């Protein structure tokens, strides 16, 4: 029974010196050993044990990790597990790598926030790719930029992060947790809204370079509730941002006042190639929906499909509200909405200052099959905000009949 | 003290046979050993030692490498370090992997060119992702397609490469090296301009499939100088290219005659989703700026933000010059420029041949807040080039007052 120190290699090195320099493996993060040499390397085959060794990708959320003895007590379940530090040169991550199951039915809210909060907390630029279906059904931890010092009590599933691409190529299912109620009426499902103190209602510390995109689907069917009441604070994405892009995605079901709303000081938003389908249910008590609610400057909303096939959205809904300057709505299709576009000049603290003059609102090359209004102009009465110019050109509009009182009653419309 | 050859495995193989087949690790490229078995594999944890083991990504520019004994003297500091050959199946690279620090203050010009020149020299198609801030402050080596046989003496920071995506998701800072002077007035910061001999002024050997994109920023503030003089040869990107795309990026500060100029025989350029901000300083001796200078055919300039908030660019600047055929300028916003678009029909060796007829110049759906000209038509006097057609349609133009003589003097405008 001789020492590894006593065995010698055709290089002249101890088996012991070689063993200290060997890339080794363990099955799962649970198997990360607690007394390894500082600087040890492990390939971890999967986050958890394989659920089924017969299927094509048995091992999920595998990682290469280096042990950093001085961080051995840090366990974020992602970048550093009991000092084993995740190696990812290109900063491209998946939810499996933070212990998400991605089985479409396990609530992955907590384990997904271990990924997103890690990238937030460490100012990491990168990409999160979602290739497998997920379920969200609980509150995303209110830490870091998801603290709620104003106490709006918006339900959140996902922490958006500055300089992170969220690439959604599978179905995200949102569950009944996120249904509205009289007691907690508000929601912001994928939050890009940082409020630093009790006074910071509109997110003065803007996020930067938010990208939400991909070929997947965000399904809010399971959030639909007769209990949900009208509140302006019901969003798929509420952002305070400089530089945001939301593209490619299908959004369907739920009870939202808006799919996407920006904030007072927001700039450079691009919303394109998406499908917005039935974002306000028949049977809730909501009674108003505007799919996109454009606050701030340089916002372009284009090449999107807006559709209501239910009754209630065919009786009161608008595809886009233009609340500020340099806001264009172009090359969209709008199916069944009463209202195509609103120019809304509201002299109110969430948007326009006293004496503010709004310029460069454009709406062009849209198709609309609508029953009520192609262009709506709103303001408060007797206030100091003014519109310089709005151009509404080259739109192809067909006015169609709204659903009947019989269809309203057959569909159980409430609200 | 027994031979590894004498120790035997539950497989019946020598510890020596196993040791020859073990993936091993070293800390840094400096640690790459000089007498390993041909075919040995090392995981190199980082390019350099970690700067700080407490932070989230302690190890940067880690690599897997195979020793190729026959290349043991080749050291490009990237694909082959003393015969250790970099393994990267998808050809996705980062500047850390060539020994860039990416700390935003160390001059990474040389180490970044070790990456770009390697991909050039070996005709490698792939992607370079930049997720961390960099600084450039010296001349990019004049080798390969950056040789200067015409002796224009353009200062260059970055070698663009055919069939390489440059993905910039952080801030690139350009330093005072790149400031103009009377002695070396010319620059081409990210060069896609190959000139093969002393006679090849306009890049006859076009690059192919240049992509420059991302969510980041190119900051030329530190290049701004009272010493910089007007020269046409002052560019962020001067390309001779077939197939180029520049998208998503913010460009700000500096003293450029153009942000982007193409060449006589260039084709299929797409310039979109960018922000061009203050690309000519108040205090330099430059007196003319056109953001985009379109030479060749099939060039589309769209969905960009052009802005001068300084004085000098609010007194002489144009967003786009159309110098050739199939050139469209559309869906842009232009803030503060005197001039929106120029149709420039110059019968000159850098562009139009004798008797050349320019066709299909279009400018549509733009917003402009400008003080001098919506559409400018230029030519040389008494020459043989002609314009067939220019269409300028569906633009929304507001003529605003230029800055005052007081604002000019308060801003120290020179030039
Ligand atoms: Cl049109």
Residue numbers in the entry:
A (entry chain A), B (entry chain A): 153 to 567
Give passages from the manuscript:
APK14_gp49 structure consists of an N-terminal domain (residues 153–277) that possesses two α-helices (167–173 and 261–274) as well as four stranded β-sheet (176–241), a central β-helix domain (278–730) having 14 rungs and a C-terminal six-stranded β-barrel domain (731–851). Rungs 6–12 of the central β-helix domain are rungs, where B1, B3, and T3 are solvent-exposed, and T2 faces the three-fold symmetry axis of the trimer. Rungs 1–5 have only two β-strands, B2 and B3, and rungs 13–14 lack B2 and possess only B1 and B3. The APK14_gp49 β-helix domain is stabilized by 10 salt bridges, 79 hydrogen bonds, and hydrophobic interactions in a manner similar to those of APK16_gp47. APK14_gp49 crystallographic trimer has a diameter of 75Å and a length of about 150Å. Each subunit of the trimer has an interface area of about 2948Å2 (11% of the total subunit area). The trimer is dominantly stabilized by polar interactions, including a total of 105 hydrogen bonds and 15 salt bridges, while the hydrophobic impact is relatively small. The trimer has two non-interacting cavities in the central β-helix domain and one cavity in the N-terminal domain. In contrast to TSD APK16_gp47, in the APK14_gp49 trimer, the central cavities contain solvent molecules. Cleavage of the A. baumannii AB5256 CPS with depolymerase APK14_gp49 resulted in monomer 3 and dimer 4 of the K unit.
